[model samples]
Target: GMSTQYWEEEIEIMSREKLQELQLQRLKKTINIAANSPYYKEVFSKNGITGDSIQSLDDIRKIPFTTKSDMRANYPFGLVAGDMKRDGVRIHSSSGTTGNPTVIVHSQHDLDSWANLVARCLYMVGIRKTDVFQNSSGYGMFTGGLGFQYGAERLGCLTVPAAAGNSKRQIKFISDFKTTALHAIPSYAIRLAEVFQEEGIDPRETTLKTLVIGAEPHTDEQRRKIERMLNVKAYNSFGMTEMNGPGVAFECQEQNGMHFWEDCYLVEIIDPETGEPVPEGEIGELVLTTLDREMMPLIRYRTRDLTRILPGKCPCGRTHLRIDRIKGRSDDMFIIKGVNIFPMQVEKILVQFPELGSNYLITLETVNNQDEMIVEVELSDLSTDNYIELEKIRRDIIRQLKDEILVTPKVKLVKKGSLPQSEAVRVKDLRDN
Candidate 1:
């Protein structure tokens, strides 16, 4: 089994001896460098951590956790990236939807490491050096488009800098340049497929050989459909702008799960409440520490994503541990009538119904001082469009939600394509009292 091969079925996954060796070596270097950063010097001392005692990644328990507030407290280039001024460097910022945008600085070394991580993911996905990649992810302050572009170029791919713009031109460029691979959000790929079909052009007829998607949560069902429509292999990659865009971990052809770049980043899944590492296969909050990042290295930073660690080497031959698809964010969990609930919980129930597609929306609101959730279900009717079957399906969905969730979610049946198909947001929280 893949689990038994490379890593022991432990939270950290690497061999007991190997884990300690690598972690201690990296820990020593990171501690020494962090000592030079003003933010770390202040934060570590404030927490009574001299930053020298962290002999191993396991000793990460000694340091105080870095949070979004830490970023905000520093403002601009918060804890994620150190102040570029501390050392002569360059800086960039990301548009923050929750609060003030974050600023990230990069020394010459930081830029090279960033490219290395991206290149690693592309290499894992089997992109050939001769392949032509069309990078459609957005550019500018956001790392999605440009971060990946740098990585692809580093790997010597025929780089097409076709960034986000009109889908029409993107399609035309895909045809004009004879691109072999594409990088973009899955939702945008679906939109492009629609445009191609509408224009009497089959995407399968194109020169594209593979589609790599990241920057958002996506369903495997949608991936299969994309593969069928585009006649290419669809691979899923996971990463964040705070962590240097995509390439934290990526899936290979096996598609079992994503392999983390263990050498560069230390991944730990801890009990959300206890802050202790959870046993393998148990869902917990993901916390990461950047071992190689120099610009602004994050230490034991809490990520809202909830997923379990899969210990062992992958069949693809990589020894890095795998992380399951994120179930939901810690904040996305809410209490409804004494029962803990998550949007993905409803999503799990919704996807179990074959009659429906991946377009269901979950809405939560307060009514009479009580929290209530309504599931807006969109049913696929390409086979048969009938009122009778629709009503029966709606009743079944409501029953399923009640049975599985224990809270009877209001199931609103909307015709397919009626609900907005944009990928801006999935779940809507309407807290009306």
Candidate 2:
């Protein structure tokens, strides 16, 4: 049943020399492909670089880094695999949270490689051929649902593709199919756990054994709550459509850290501000270079996510390097009331209160030479319950804010589901300052 097997120990502890040699070989080949790509043709020609000049991994710095704007510059399919016609490639676009969506194109080879990577990650997370998978990740432009489904099928598991939301249908299929494992978002899992108890369903009565969550960062407390509610072990996942999907790295039951598949992706953490590499164990921006992507290769693409590399062998005997939870995105940081604020920092403190359901609004305004940060929070009840006091909860939220961050934000407690609904990840900056 454990057919997805590889010598993790040997690969994890690979000498720097061997790792570099393999990286160079892959990098050289990928560069040649990129050089011929219409998207990268001008980029390389303008910079006067060829595959020959990029002799080693260190020379990667000589090549300019590509960003979201670069994709927008080419529009829909402009930056696709230039060597091949657009019809010859398979493309997936990210949710257009900012402006136009960013597209990721793949060839036949690229598609299979992505599926294989996710399959490898599935095996690492204790998923086996005998496991029955329930996929709760969203489908369509979102990558998690489909990518994980393919991986589960590839690994010879019975896959039930149930995309995100629709809790009613999710419960029905999960119980009917007797899914042994689930791939989904942690927040949504929390919702399912709540629905189960509300509907008088005994989650423990079902065959669900484990959960895999990703596409969003989650807290250790959240993981514990899901496990308790669903009556099963909960695991965390990390990845993006840019690199494939939700199976970049995964945490085992030990819950120590998520191990990255260094065999395909060369992970590097660098200072967010300086754009320079950081030493291991230090928080920095995550940069990825795909060693084996053939269709659309991303080299040293800056994720803007803040995290650090965790060294040492895992207790599970996997030699893959581990990465800490992605804390916050550099782009999501804002200046509020003369202090630098990150939305995720506020969310971490917000989730401690069970009354909130992962919905909140962050607005910043400048008033009379002062910046005001307004936090519009949705409440479980009419901003209070019969047993609990309103003023007390408000003060508690303020206290938590002050304790976690030096500044206390103005909290406006609104009714449940009163906030604006979003079609995708929501971010707004109203501040003129």
Candidate 3:
């Protein structure tokens, strides 16, 4: 029954040729709308770009690529198009670390389209109107909270905007409300499972039936582990604030890969260095163009995310293109001993070991002018009294990690609960700092 359900059946199941035809039409409309913006107007004129410049989908390559730097240079209001008299209904921004954050404005139409897109993804994952959805993601400037809130509500679910943090309260809400669906970062969900253990409550006994995880890259092994612990089928979600947030791509019940909605967004994968499209199934930087957005429409925006298109059509019967798990951000990859490595590679191996805790940290430092990779992992059973056995276990972990990552790393066994709680800050590069 769930497999046949869809929020937008016509668009979701359209044939490839028909979908591309729709995309081209929407793209031209978007280009015309973008030319009205002050920033794009100037940019277009400078490059001789016009509404009619795009004769075919291939002509999209003629338009200049947009980057984070370009957005930053424009800042607060430079990208806003159309007449100021008809301003946007809402604005959401990415958190800025050093300076002003990038902001995106959403018109009423934009918001409606976003909601429907999210609802479609939710329905594809088996979320029904009878379900109870408790959003454990943060609210405000961060888009996940409001994005899921609106989508769940749109899907006719009994939605609770529980917000984020306050692990105890989250547990209480689920227990009291019999929450059936939840959304949170993958790491946070693992942390919440720890709390469930401390409270002598098993998540398997909870009313939750579905778990949606995103905002950070996590491995399939991690998803299955959480599913087993929580007794729910966890689905991976993919999105970014620049692309109007979390409904851009999502895993269907098939769970083979996340389907990126091509009708609303035009997606492209290009070599980060060459700025050219890679062969199909080859990993590269993800670039997107907003076809349905009216306010602040972006063209060929480089997401800096690294992933590949899963070749062949999905068994789910949807014509939308599916993208593989994000390997790592193009900027996040680190080279050690001339081998490129992603932190997720370390996480995948570490989680498979039952003796290790979920939290871990990776440190890159220069020792005697040579780069050194050190991994600090928490021990799950630190009470083991056999000193000789502990030494053997430690050496075995080092050997296994070296085999997976292809570079021997210095392993430090840390006491459980000593590592920082924030997953984003777990990796430290002290080579230059």
For all predicted structures, in order, the TM-scores are: 0.72, 0.74, 0.77
Give a tens-digit lDDT track for model 2, residues 182-297: 88666677777767767789866778888887665567876787888788888778887778766678785468889787667878787878888797699998888777777777
Residue 110 lDDT in candidate 3: 88
Question: In model 1, what lDDT does residue 134 have?
Answer: 93
How do the residues 191-258 of candidate 1 rate in per-residue lDDT, one tens digit apiece? 78877878788978999988998665666886888899889898888887667767788886788788
Q: What is the lDDT of residue 267 in candidate 3?
A: 92
Error of 1 at 52 (Å): 4.0
**RMSD of model 3, in Å?**
11.9
Whole-model lDDT, candidate 1? 0.72
**What are the lDDT figures for the candidates, one per model?**
0.72, 0.72, 0.83
Q: Per-residue CA lDDT of candidate 3, range 349-372, in tens?
A: 777677778889899886643457
* Top candidate by lDDT: 3
Q: Higher-TM-score candidate among 1 and 3?
A: 3
Off-target runs (Cα >4 Å) in candidate 2 are: 1-17, 82-89, 333-433
Output the worst ten-in-a-row residue range by lDDT, candidate 2.
1-10
What shift in Å separates residue 255 of candidate 1 from its native position after superposition? 0.9
